Amino acid sequence: RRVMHFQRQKLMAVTEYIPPKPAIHPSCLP
Amino acid sequence: KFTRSRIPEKVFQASPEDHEKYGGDPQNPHKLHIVTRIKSTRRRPYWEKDIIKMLGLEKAHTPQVHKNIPSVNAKLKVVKHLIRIKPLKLPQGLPAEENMSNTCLKSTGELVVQW
Amino acid sequence: RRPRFVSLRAKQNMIRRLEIEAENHYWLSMPYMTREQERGHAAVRRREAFEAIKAAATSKFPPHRFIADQLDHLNVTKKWS
Amino acid sequence: LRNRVTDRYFRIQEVLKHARHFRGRKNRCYRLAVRTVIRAFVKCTKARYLKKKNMRTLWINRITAASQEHGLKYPALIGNLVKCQVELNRKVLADLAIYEPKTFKSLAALASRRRHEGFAAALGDGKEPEGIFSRVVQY
Amino acid sequence: RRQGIKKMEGHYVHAGNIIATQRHFRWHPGAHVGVGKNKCLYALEEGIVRYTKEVYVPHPRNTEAVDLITRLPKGAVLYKTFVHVVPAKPEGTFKLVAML
Amino acid sequence: TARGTPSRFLASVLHNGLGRYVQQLQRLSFSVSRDGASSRGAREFVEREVIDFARRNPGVVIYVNSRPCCVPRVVAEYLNGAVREESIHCKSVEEISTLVQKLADQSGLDVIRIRKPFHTDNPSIQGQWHPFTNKPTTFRGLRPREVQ
RNA sequence: CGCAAUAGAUAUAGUACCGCAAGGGAAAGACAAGCAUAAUAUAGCAAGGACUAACCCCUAUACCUUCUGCAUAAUGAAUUAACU
RNA sequence: CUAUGUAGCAAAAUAGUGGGAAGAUUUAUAGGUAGAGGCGACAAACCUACCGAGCCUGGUGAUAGCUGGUUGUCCAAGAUAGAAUCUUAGUUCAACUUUAAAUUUGCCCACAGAACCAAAUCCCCUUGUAAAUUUAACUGUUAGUCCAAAGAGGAACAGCUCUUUGGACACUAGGAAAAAACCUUGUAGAGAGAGUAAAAAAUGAUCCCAAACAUAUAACUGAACUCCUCACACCCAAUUGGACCAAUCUA
RNA sequence: UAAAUAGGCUCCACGAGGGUUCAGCUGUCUCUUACUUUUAACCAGUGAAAUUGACCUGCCCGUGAGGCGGGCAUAACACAGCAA
RNA sequence: ACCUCCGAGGCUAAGACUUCACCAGUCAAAGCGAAGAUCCAAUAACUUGACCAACGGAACAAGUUACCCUAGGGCAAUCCUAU
Ligand SMILES: [Mg+2]
Ligand SMILES: [Mg+2]
Ligand SMILES: [Mg+2]
Ligand SMILES: [Mg+2]
Ligand SMILES: [Mg+2]
Ligand SMILES: [Mg+2]
Ligand SMILES: [Mg+2]
Ligand SMILES: [Mg+2]
Ligand SMILES: [Mg+2]
Ligand SMILES: [Mg+2]
Ligand SMILES: [Mg+2]
Ligand SMILES: [Mg+2]
Ligand SMILES: [Mg+2]
Ligand SMILES: [Mg+2]
Ligand SMILES: [Mg+2]
Ligand SMILES: [Mg+2]
Ligand SMILES: [Mg+2]
Ligand SMILES: [Mg+2]
Ligand SMILES: [Mg+2]
Ligand SMILES: [Zn+2]
């Protein structure tokens, strides 16, 4: 689990998965 | 090893979603590119230092004009990450032998006469 | 220690550069000519420019020498009287 | 002895004259005066960059103080005077804050006005008529 | 050792110039390209070099090849590379020598 | 070096440009040897440049004498009392003309570090800042946490 | 187009002095450093930017030579003058 | 044998304690043995304080692939393939560098093309460029460190030896705390002008270690990069080219 | 010896040779103490030497340490000790 | 690579290739005729050889310096332990 070069770190951070927000919260609506 | 990068052509294919996102058009493309350097040649391989020295982009931002023909694009596809390319716009036409000394290039990329 | 903690400012800087280069991708997928159309249209200018380089390189030679410059050095003893 | 330097005195005094104001033996002994004088001149050269940087940071501090006197941070003042197309720089902004308080009061009022116009515009839906101060003047 | 091509396609090669130095027969000789004892390929006639893919029909006098072609199905063929030199200049010209 | 050098503030002689500009240089003495080799540029200047300079500056009294006998020099005197010497030995006529014009184009103050680049005698118009500008006042002038 | 008292001979002298001896072999005669007048005051390569103001504020890892760069890793320098 | 002394009283002494003290003892005086030699109850012991080879003068300014040094101003080009060598602490050739000179193509580069048994590489029409080859003449460097990557050796580790492609360093400047090797940035001066680049954390042994802060609109700050007013030869080692010049003597 | 890795070809005499043991003796020690002399510290005279880049010469933690970074401390100045 | 696995000691002539120098080495159209270095020695000769295998080769030289002197340089495969 070695460390990464810093620029590879930034590339991994910027390209991180962002999930699609659900239209409504399930708790307060089916 | 570290080697020159051959970019697949698939990337250089404007989509119907890209066309309305920038002020362009598939048909009737644009004559000249206005190109500026926004990154250092240092810390990059020599086959980019030489390209930049050839396109006249030695100095920093300092915009410079080039043809939009594939013989030059092949060079700009190697240094595409150290430059900003915008398309020159001529909404008043090429200047005449008069109005050469009274031109001006606005930040939007339009060449105009008498400011 | 060795690992770092990539900030938000760095992410925003990187996204700025990514967007600029995506625009660059776009402005290179539409050339005015094709490979065959362009061929030769700049030949005359290139030939004349290299001929200018040649004529510059083949003109080196010592400068002239004038008698006036040599005799002007006698002025280093000019006196009033 | 055919040739002997007859004027080493003046070459020494050329370097000591720049060290009379030093402290220690290194204001009369050449072997030390030279090294410290050279360091002095190198700092003298390299210090102009810091002079500019420091005066600018002093001006930013004074402007932050003055602008906070009127309930308005420094990001707002500069980032919303330019949106009113006033190209006053920071030296003259500091001078106004110290020596012309009411003019600076007016400039701060203008900045707050433009800030409010921006907030109101962005809060709205569409391109409703622009603010009375938010209208750009073209060249 | 440097056993590789030394004149690539579309190069002007004069008489006697070596086209390719090889160990095995990677590139077989073609039109105007001669072979030496060490399998070097050299340009017999001044011209321009080209590379092509052709059909292979070995000498019956040779044995290690005349038999392998005998072990191939109907409709089979051994294709192989060749290097030719299309000659550039003509053999000669005729000029007036005497008007008698 | 700055620390190792005097300094002054930006100033003029007698509020020079306020009423009427006055030219500070008032006297200029040239010593030119009639024979010395170092006095060649000086001799050229006197022979073909000093008359024109005298005409262009009628407030400057220019004396020229021929008794240093080996070395020239120009001594410029000003209204405010300052003197200033300059060497013109082994210099060209172009250099001497440029120098003499420079002398005639400056006030006789000291050439030292000007601390400020702007000198103003009435720096404030609206009243210089003091900690009670931009600060309110309260009823009857009470300090915080008072009673009466 | 040789030196001018650290040069020119080593030389005022092969003396003084060193060595048992062979032998070695000098010096000199006509306001530099160091101090005193006047000890010092938080803080730090001793300076620079400055400042009304000496300190206080901000900046600032001595020099030469050797090792791939060397925080001084190591070598050399108390300092002045002359000679090199 | 111990203590003092260690620039000491002394370049081996002082105080005590000790061995011999009619003998192979100790000792004054003159003579002899002379340096690869003498003498030696052999310890490489001693031959005028320093003997595994005295001392002085001469050859001698010994030689030194080793250490140390090498003196005015300013500008400019300028760096890590390799081969042989009683050779790896060095030299010669090449490669690279510099100057002067001649000539005309040099670099980048698509399409075509390079075998049977993944990155890319080679080659050229055009195109962007202005450089490249050749000749004359010299010196200097040469088997460097770190980082990304692909391999071989040691685990796939030991911050490990080696080969290759690239970058940086030994050159400027700003950042990550200090920071040669990461990120940003080069062509140089003055300015009390301006715009930017990179750049902030999330959820065992002397003495913890910036202080703080959950919610006032996202922009601002930030270089020698760039723009601005003026001026311009005026920020690399070894090396190489050039412009000036202090002081002395002579005409 | 309480306890031991130590000591225990024949061949008188001798040894500042090496090892061991009995008995005694004693500040060697358990455990140091007092006094005297020299040294010492002060006054007066005479007066060196190694050493020395410059110093306006702090502590803790980190980096790779009086001097760098981040915290802490901090009016100046002798005299006698100590040795991290 | 003391990394990974094995052996060897006819003449003339355009043009080229090469073991990253040089020295060596290599291919060759046409044309004419037939089908491991240098120096040394013996030599009329046409030319000739061993060593140079430390194989770019001193013509012929080993063991050793505890008496030495000078110039200088100086995140463990196998494992121990706790959850
Ligand atoms: Mg700035
Ligand atoms: Mg003498
Ligand atoms: Mg003498
Ligand atoms: Mg003095
Ligand atoms: Mg230290
Ligand atoms: Mg020392
Ligand atoms: Mg010598
Ligand atoms: Mg050697
Ligand atoms: Mg340069
Ligand atoms: Mg080509
Ligand atoms: Mg610049
Ligand atoms: Mg005995
Ligand atoms: Mg005393
Ligand atoms: Mg420490
Ligand atoms: Mg003390
Ligand atoms: Mg070769
Ligand atoms: Mg034939
Ligand atoms: Mg050998
Ligand atoms: Mg060999
Ligand atoms: Zn709920």
Side-chain angles (χ1 to χ4, degrees), chain E residues 2 6 15-18:
Chain E
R2 290 152 295 282
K6 306 192 178 294
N17 277 11
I18 308 189

mmCIF file with all atom_site columns, all heavy atoms in Angstrom, chain E residues 2 6 15-18, chain J residues 15-19:
data_model
loop_
_atom_site.group_PDB
_atom_site.id
_atom_site.type_symbol
_atom_site.label_atom_id
_atom_site.label_alt_id
_atom_site.label_comp_id
_atom_site.label_asym_id
_atom_site.label_entity_id
_atom_site.label_seq_id
_atom_site.pdbx_PDB_ins_code
_atom_site.Cartn_x
_atom_site.Cartn_y
_atom_site.Cartn_z
_atom_site.occupancy
_atom_site.B_iso_or_equiv
_atom_site.pdbx_formal_charge
_atom_site.auth_seq_id
_atom_site.auth_comp_id
_atom_site.auth_asym_id
_atom_site.auth_atom_id
_atom_site.pdbx_PDB_model_num
ATOM 1   N N     . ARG E 1 2  ? 24.001 -5.241 -35.657 1.00 0.00 ? 2  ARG E N     1
ATOM 2   C CA    . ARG E 1 2  ? 23.264 -4.337 -36.541 1.00 0.00 ? 2  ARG E CA    1
ATOM 3   C C     . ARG E 1 2  ? 22.811 -5.045 -37.824 1.00 0.00 ? 2  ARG E C     1
ATOM 4   O O     . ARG E 1 2  ? 23.169 -4.671 -38.941 1.00 0.00 ? 2  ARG E O     1
ATOM 5   C CB    . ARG E 1 2  ? 24.113 -3.103 -36.859 1.00 0.00 ? 2  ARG E CB    1
ATOM 6   C CG    . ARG E 1 2  ? 24.299 -2.195 -35.662 1.00 0.00 ? 2  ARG E CG    1
ATOM 7   C CD    . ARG E 1 2  ? 25.591 -1.423 -35.724 1.00 0.00 ? 2  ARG E CD    1
ATOM 8   N NE    . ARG E 1 2  ? 26.736 -2.316 -35.641 1.00 0.00 ? 2  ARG E NE    1
ATOM 9   C CZ    . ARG E 1 2  ? 27.188 -2.857 -34.515 1.00 0.00 ? 2  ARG E CZ    1
ATOM 10  N NH1   . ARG E 1 2  ? 26.597 -2.600 -33.354 1.00 0.00 ? 2  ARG E NH1   1
ATOM 11  N NH2   . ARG E 1 2  ? 28.239 -3.661 -34.549 1.00 0.00 ? 2  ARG E NH2   1
ATOM 12  N N     . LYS E 1 6  ? 18.935 -0.907 -43.775 1.00 0.00 ? 6  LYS E N     1
ATOM 13  C CA    . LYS E 1 6  ? 19.781 0.273  -43.829 1.00 0.00 ? 6  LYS E CA    1
ATOM 14  C C     . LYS E 1 6  ? 19.394 1.238  -44.929 1.00 0.00 ? 6  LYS E C     1
ATOM 15  O O     . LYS E 1 6  ? 19.956 2.338  -44.981 1.00 0.00 ? 6  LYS E O     1
ATOM 16  C CB    . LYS E 1 6  ? 21.248 -0.130 -44.010 1.00 0.00 ? 6  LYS E CB    1
ATOM 17  C CG    . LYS E 1 6  ? 21.712 -1.108 -42.953 1.00 0.00 ? 6  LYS E CG    1
ATOM 18  C CD    . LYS E 1 6  ? 23.209 -1.281 -42.959 1.00 0.00 ? 6  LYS E CD    1
ATOM 19  C CE    . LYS E 1 6  ? 23.646 -2.236 -41.867 1.00 0.00 ? 6  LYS E CE    1
ATOM 20  N NZ    . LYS E 1 6  ? 23.389 -1.695 -40.508 1.00 0.00 ? 6  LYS E NZ    1
ATOM 21  N N     . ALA E 1 15 ? 24.230 1.955  -57.130 1.00 0.00 ? 15 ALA E N     1
ATOM 22  C CA    . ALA E 1 15 ? 24.700 0.611  -57.404 1.00 0.00 ? 15 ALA E CA    1
ATOM 23  C C     . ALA E 1 15 ? 25.637 0.152  -56.302 1.00 0.00 ? 15 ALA E C     1
ATOM 24  O O     . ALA E 1 15 ? 26.518 0.899  -55.874 1.00 0.00 ? 15 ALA E O     1
ATOM 25  C CB    . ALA E 1 15 ? 25.412 0.572  -58.752 1.00 0.00 ? 15 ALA E CB    1
ATOM 26  N N     . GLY E 1 16 ? 25.437 -1.073 -55.834 1.00 0.00 ? 16 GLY E N     1
ATOM 27  C CA    . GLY E 1 16 ? 26.323 -1.668 -54.864 1.00 0.00 ? 16 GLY E CA    1
ATOM 28  C C     . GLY E 1 16 ? 26.008 -1.360 -53.421 1.00 0.00 ? 16 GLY E C     1
ATOM 29  O O     . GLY E 1 16 ? 26.529 -2.045 -52.535 1.00 0.00 ? 16 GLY E O     1
ATOM 30  N N     . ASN E 1 17 ? 25.171 -0.367 -53.147 1.00 0.00 ? 17 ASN E N     1
ATOM 31  C CA    . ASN E 1 17 ? 24.854 -0.011 -51.775 1.00 0.00 ? 17 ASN E CA    1
ATOM 32  C C     . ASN E 1 17 ? 24.050 -1.124 -51.126 1.00 0.00 ? 17 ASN E C     1
ATOM 33  O O     . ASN E 1 17 ? 23.171 -1.712 -51.757 1.00 0.00 ? 17 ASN E O     1
ATOM 34  C CB    . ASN E 1 17 ? 24.080 1.299  -51.733 1.00 0.00 ? 17 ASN E CB    1
ATOM 35  C CG    . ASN E 1 17 ? 24.980 2.502  -51.788 1.00 0.00 ? 17 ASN E CG    1
ATOM 36  O OD1   . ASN E 1 17 ? 26.170 2.387  -52.060 1.00 0.00 ? 17 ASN E OD1   1
ATOM 37  N ND2   . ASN E 1 17 ? 24.418 3.669  -51.528 1.00 0.00 ? 17 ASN E ND2   1
ATOM 38  N N     . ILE E 1 18 ? 24.362 -1.423 -49.868 1.00 0.00 ? 18 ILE E N     1
ATOM 39  C CA    . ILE E 1 18 ? 23.673 -2.496 -49.170 1.00 0.00 ? 18 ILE E CA    1
ATOM 40  C C     . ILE E 1 18 ? 22.288 -2.015 -48.771 1.00 0.00 ? 18 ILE E C     1
ATOM 41  O O     . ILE E 1 18 ? 22.133 -0.941 -48.182 1.00 0.00 ? 18 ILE E O     1
ATOM 42  C CB    . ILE E 1 18 ? 24.482 -2.958 -47.952 1.00 0.00 ? 18 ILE E CB    1
ATOM 43  C CG1   . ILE E 1 18 ? 25.910 -3.289 -48.364 1.00 0.00 ? 18 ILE E CG1   1
ATOM 44  C CG2   . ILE E 1 18 ? 23.851 -4.181 -47.324 1.00 0.00 ? 18 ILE E CG2   1
ATOM 45  C CD1   . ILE E 1 18 ? 26.717 -3.961 -47.290 1.00 0.00 ? 18 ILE E CD1   1
ATOM 46  P P     . G   J 2 15 ? 33.336 4.792  -55.792 1.00 0.00 ? 15 G   J P     1
ATOM 47  O OP1   . G   J 2 15 ? 33.449 6.260  -55.690 1.00 0.00 ? 15 G   J OP1   1
ATOM 48  O OP2   . G   J 2 15 ? 34.493 3.972  -55.383 1.00 0.00 ? 15 G   J OP2   1
ATOM 49  O "O5'" . G   J 2 15 ? 32.084 4.288  -54.955 1.00 0.00 ? 15 G   J "O5'" 1
ATOM 50  C "C5'" . G   J 2 15 ? 30.801 4.857  -55.147 1.00 0.00 ? 15 G   J "C5'" 1
ATOM 51  C "C4'" . G   J 2 15 ? 29.727 3.813  -55.061 1.00 0.00 ? 15 G   J "C4'" 1
ATOM 52  O "O4'" . G   J 2 15 ? 30.254 2.555  -55.543 1.00 0.00 ? 15 G   J "O4'" 1
ATOM 53  C "C3'" . G   J 2 15 ? 29.225 3.490  -53.668 1.00 0.00 ? 15 G   J "C3'" 1
ATOM 54  O "O3'" . G   J 2 15 ? 28.258 4.403  -53.196 1.00 0.00 ? 15 G   J "O3'" 1
ATOM 55  C "C2'" . G   J 2 15 ? 28.698 2.074  -53.831 1.00 0.00 ? 15 G   J "C2'" 1
ATOM 56  O "O2'" . G   J 2 15 ? 27.430 2.069  -54.462 1.00 0.00 ? 15 G   J "O2'" 1
ATOM 57  C "C1'" . G   J 2 15 ? 29.724 1.488  -54.788 1.00 0.00 ? 15 G   J "C1'" 1
ATOM 58  N N9    . G   J 2 15 ? 30.837 0.831  -54.083 1.00 0.00 ? 15 G   J N9    1
ATOM 59  C C8    . G   J 2 15 ? 32.133 1.267  -54.061 1.00 0.00 ? 15 G   J C8    1
ATOM 60  N N7    . G   J 2 15 ? 32.919 0.498  -53.374 1.00 0.00 ? 15 G   J N7    1
ATOM 61  C C5    . G   J 2 15 ? 32.084 -0.504 -52.923 1.00 0.00 ? 15 G   J C5    1
ATOM 62  C C6    . G   J 2 15 ? 32.380 -1.621 -52.122 1.00 0.00 ? 15 G   J C6    1
ATOM 63  O O6    . G   J 2 15 ? 33.469 -1.948 -51.648 1.00 0.00 ? 15 G   J O6    1
ATOM 64  N N1    . G   J 2 15 ? 31.260 -2.399 -51.889 1.00 0.00 ? 15 G   J N1    1
ATOM 65  C C2    . G   J 2 15 ? 30.011 -2.129 -52.364 1.00 0.00 ? 15 G   J C2    1
ATOM 66  N N2    . G   J 2 15 ? 29.048 -2.993 -52.035 1.00 0.00 ? 15 G   J N2    1
ATOM 67  N N3    . G   J 2 15 ? 29.725 -1.086 -53.116 1.00 0.00 ? 15 G   J N3    1
ATOM 68  C C4    . G   J 2 15 ? 30.801 -0.322 -53.351 1.00 0.00 ? 15 G   J C4    1
ATOM 69  P P     . A   J 2 16 ? 28.567 5.318  -51.915 1.00 0.00 ? 16 A   J P     1
ATOM 70  O OP1   . A   J 2 16 ? 27.274 5.826  -51.410 1.00 0.00 ? 16 A   J OP1   1
ATOM 71  O OP2   . A   J 2 16 ? 29.630 6.272  -52.279 1.00 0.00 ? 16 A   J OP2   1
ATOM 72  O "O5'" . A   J 2 16 ? 29.179 4.307  -50.855 1.00 0.00 ? 16 A   J "O5'" 1
ATOM 73  C "C5'" . A   J 2 16 ? 28.577 4.105  -49.587 1.00 0.00 ? 16 A   J "C5'" 1
ATOM 74  C "C4'" . A   J 2 16 ? 27.966 2.734  -49.488 1.00 0.00 ? 16 A   J "C4'" 1
ATOM 75  O "O4'" . A   J 2 16 ? 28.728 1.806  -50.300 1.00 0.00 ? 16 A   J "O4'" 1
ATOM 76  C "C3'" . A   J 2 16 ? 27.968 2.108  -48.106 1.00 0.00 ? 16 A   J "C3'" 1
ATOM 77  O "O3'" . A   J 2 16 ? 26.897 2.557  -47.299 1.00 0.00 ? 16 A   J "O3'" 1
ATOM 78  C "C2'" . A   J 2 16 ? 27.926 0.623  -48.417 1.00 0.00 ? 16 A   J "C2'" 1
ATOM 79  O "O2'" . A   J 2 16 ? 26.614 0.223  -48.769 1.00 0.00 ? 16 A   J "O2'" 1
ATOM 80  C "C1'" . A   J 2 16 ? 28.806 0.554  -49.661 1.00 0.00 ? 16 A   J "C1'" 1
ATOM 81  N N9    . A   J 2 16 ? 30.229 0.288  -49.365 1.00 0.00 ? 16 A   J N9    1
ATOM 82  C C8    . A   J 2 16 ? 31.287 1.068  -49.749 1.00 0.00 ? 16 A   J C8    1
ATOM 83  N N7    . A   J 2 16 ? 32.455 0.614  -49.386 1.00 0.00 ? 16 A   J N7    1
ATOM 84  C C5    . A   J 2 16 ? 32.150 -0.554 -48.716 1.00 0.00 ? 16 A   J C5    1
ATOM 85  C C6    . A   J 2 16 ? 32.958 -1.502 -48.083 1.00 0.00 ? 16 A   J C6    1
ATOM 86  N N6    . A   J 2 16 ? 34.283 -1.423 -48.019 1.00 0.00 ? 16 A   J N6    1
ATOM 87  N N1    . A   J 2 16 ? 32.357 -2.553 -47.504 1.00 0.00 ? 16 A   J N1    1
ATOM 88  C C2    . A   J 2 16 ? 31.028 -2.626 -47.573 1.00 0.00 ? 16 A   J C2    1
ATOM 89  N N3    . A   J 2 16 ? 30.160 -1.801 -48.140 1.00 0.00 ? 16 A   J N3    1
ATOM 90  C C4    . A   J 2 16 ? 30.790 -0.772 -48.704 1.00 0.00 ? 16 A   J C4    1
ATOM 91  P P     . C   J 2 17 ? 27.179 3.112  -45.822 1.00 0.00 ? 17 C   J P     1
ATOM 92  O OP1   . C   J 2 17 ? 26.000 3.886  -45.386 1.00 0.00 ? 17 C   J OP1   1
ATOM 93  O OP2   . C   J 2 17 ? 28.502 3.772  -45.798 1.00 0.00 ? 17 C   J OP2   1
ATOM 94  O "O5'" . C   J 2 17 ? 27.205 1.794  -44.938 1.00 0.00 ? 17 C   J "O5'" 1
ATOM 95  C "C5'" . C   J 2 17 ? 26.071 0.950  -44.896 1.00 0.00 ? 17 C   J "C5'" 1
ATOM 96  C "C4'" . C   J 2 17 ? 26.405 -0.422 -44.376 1.00 0.00 ? 17 C   J "C4'" 1
ATOM 97  O "O4'" . C   J 2 17 ? 27.435 -1.018 -45.198 1.00 0.00 ? 17 C   J "O4'" 1
ATOM 98  C "C3'" . C   J 2 17 ? 26.977 -0.496 -42.975 1.00 0.00 ? 17 C   J "C3'" 1
ATOM 99  O "O3'" . C   J 2 17 ? 25.989 -0.396 -41.967 1.00 0.00 ? 17 C   J "O3'" 1
ATOM 100 C "C2'" . C   J 2 17 ? 27.694 -1.836 -42.991 1.00 0.00 ? 17 C   J "C2'" 1
ATOM 101 O "O2'" . C   J 2 17 ? 26.772 -2.904 -42.846 1.00 0.00 ? 17 C   J "O2'" 1
ATOM 102 C "C1'" . C   J 2 17 ? 28.239 -1.868 -44.413 1.00 0.00 ? 17 C   J "C1'" 1
ATOM 103 N N1    . C   J 2 17 ? 29.640 -1.417 -44.511 1.00 0.00 ? 17 C   J N1    1
ATOM 104 C C2    . C   J 2 17 ? 30.645 -2.186 -43.953 1.00 0.00 ? 17 C   J C2    1
ATOM 105 O O2    . C   J 2 17 ? 30.327 -3.218 -43.356 1.00 0.00 ? 17 C   J O2    1
ATOM 106 N N3    . C   J 2 17 ? 31.930 -1.789 -44.059 1.00 0.00 ? 17 C   J N3    1
ATOM 107 C C4    . C   J 2 17 ? 32.226 -0.673 -44.712 1.00 0.00 ? 17 C   J C4    1
ATOM 108 N N4    . C   J 2 17 ? 33.501 -0.300 -44.806 1.00 0.00 ? 17 C   J N4    1
ATOM 109 C C5    . C   J 2 17 ? 31.219 0.123  -45.300 1.00 0.00 ? 17 C   J C5    1
ATOM 110 C C6    . C   J 2 17 ? 29.954 -0.285 -45.185 1.00 0.00 ? 17 C   J C6    1
ATOM 111 P P     . U   J 2 18 ? 26.266 0.470  -40.647 1.00 0.00 ? 18 U   J P     1
ATOM 112 O OP1   . U   J 2 18 ? 25.044 0.399  -39.816 1.00 0.00 ? 18 U   J OP1   1
ATOM 113 O OP2   . U   J 2 18 ? 26.813 1.788  -41.034 1.00 0.00 ? 18 U   J OP2   1
ATOM 114 O "O5'" . U   J 2 18 ? 27.425 -0.324 -39.904 1.00 0.00 ? 18 U   J "O5'" 1
ATOM 115 C "C5'" . U   J 2 18 ? 27.202 -1.629 -39.400 1.00 0.00 ? 18 U   J "C5'" 1
ATOM 116 C "C4'" . U   J 2 18 ? 28.433 -2.185 -38.732 1.00 0.00 ? 18 U   J "C4'" 1
ATOM 117 O "O4'" . U   J 2 18 ? 29.454 -2.472 -39.724 1.00 0.00 ? 18 U   J "O4'" 1
ATOM 118 C "C3'" . U   J 2 18 ? 29.141 -1.266 -37.753 1.00 0.00 ? 18 U   J "C3'" 1
ATOM 119 O "O3'" . U   J 2 18 ? 28.510 -1.187 -36.488 1.00 0.00 ? 18 U   J "O3'" 1
ATOM 120 C "C2'" . U   J 2 18 ? 30.531 -1.872 -37.705 1.00 0.00 ? 18 U   J "C2'" 1
ATOM 121 O "O2'" . U   J 2 18 ? 30.549 -3.047 -36.912 1.00 0.00 ? 18 U   J "O2'" 1
ATOM 122 C "C1'" . U   J 2 18 ? 30.731 -2.254 -39.167 1.00 0.00 ? 18 U   J "C1'" 1
ATOM 123 N N1    . U   J 2 18 ? 31.396 -1.158 -39.895 1.00 0.00 ? 18 U   J N1    1
ATOM 124 C C2    . U   J 2 18 ? 32.765 -1.152 -39.869 1.00 0.00 ? 18 U   J C2    1
ATOM 125 O O2    . U   J 2 18 ? 33.408 -2.018 -39.312 1.00 0.00 ? 18 U   J O2    1
ATOM 126 N N3    . U   J 2 18 ? 33.354 -0.112 -40.529 1.00 0.00 ? 18 U   J N3    1
ATOM 127 C C4    . U   J 2 18 ? 32.722 0.911  -41.187 1.00 0.00 ? 18 U   J C4    1
ATOM 128 O O4    . U   J 2 18 ? 33.393 1.777  -41.738 1.00 0.00 ? 18 U   J O4    1
ATOM 129 C C5    . U   J 2 18 ? 31.301 0.848  -41.157 1.00 0.00 ? 18 U   J C5    1
ATOM 130 C C6    . U   J 2 18 ? 30.703 -0.159 -40.516 1.00 0.00 ? 18 U   J C6    1
ATOM 131 P P     . U   J 2 19 ? 28.794 0.069  -35.527 1.00 0.00 ? 19 U   J P     1
ATOM 132 O OP1   . U   J 2 19 ? 27.505 0.742  -35.250 1.00 0.00 ? 19 U   J OP1   1
ATOM 133 O OP2   . U   J 2 19 ? 29.906 0.860  -36.108 1.00 0.00 ? 19 U   J OP2   1
ATOM 134 O "O5'" . U   J 2 19 ? 29.309 -0.593 -34.174 1.00 0.00 ? 19 U   J "O5'" 1
ATOM 135 C "C5'" . U   J 2 19 ? 30.617 -1.152 -34.081 1.00 0.00 ? 19 U   J "C5'" 1
ATOM 136 C "C4'" . U   J 2 19 ? 30.728 -2.131 -32.940 1.00 0.00 ? 19 U   J "C4'" 1
ATOM 137 O "O4'" . U   J 2 19 ? 30.044 -3.364 -33.297 1.00 0.00 ? 19 U   J "O4'" 1
ATOM 138 C "C3'" . U   J 2 19 ? 32.151 -2.541 -32.569 1.00 0.00 ? 19 U   J "C3'" 1
ATOM 139 O "O3'" . U   J 2 19 ? 32.207 -2.839 -31.173 1.00 0.00 ? 19 U   J "O3'" 1
ATOM 140 C "C2'" . U   J 2 19 ? 32.325 -3.832 -33.352 1.00 0.00 ? 19 U   J "C2'" 1
ATOM 141 O "O2'" . U   J 2 19 ? 33.349 -4.680 -32.879 1.00 0.00 ? 19 U   J "O2'" 1
ATOM 142 C "C1'" . U   J 2 19 ? 30.944 -4.446 -33.173 1.00 0.00 ? 19 U   J "C1'" 1
ATOM 143 N N1    . U   J 2 19 ? 30.575 -5.499 -34.134 1.00 0.00 ? 19 U   J N1    1
ATOM 144 C C2    . U   J 2 19 ? 29.755 -6.500 -33.654 1.00 0.00 ? 19 U   J C2    1
ATOM 145 O O2    . U   J 2 19 ? 29.335 -6.522 -32.511 1.00 0.00 ? 19 U   J O2    1
ATOM 146 N N3    . U   J 2 19 ? 29.425 -7.475 -34.560 1.00 0.00 ? 19 U   J N3    1
ATOM 147 C C4    . U   J 2 19 ? 29.828 -7.560 -35.875 1.00 0.00 ? 19 U   J C4    1
ATOM 148 O O4    . U   J 2 19 ? 29.446 -8.505 -36.567 1.00 0.00 ? 19 U   J O4    1
ATOM 149 C C5    . U   J 2 19 ? 30.681 -6.495 -36.301 1.00 0.00 ? 19 U   J C5    1
ATOM 150 C C6    . U   J 2 19 ? 31.016 -5.531 -35.434 1.00 0.00 ? 19 U   J C6    1
#
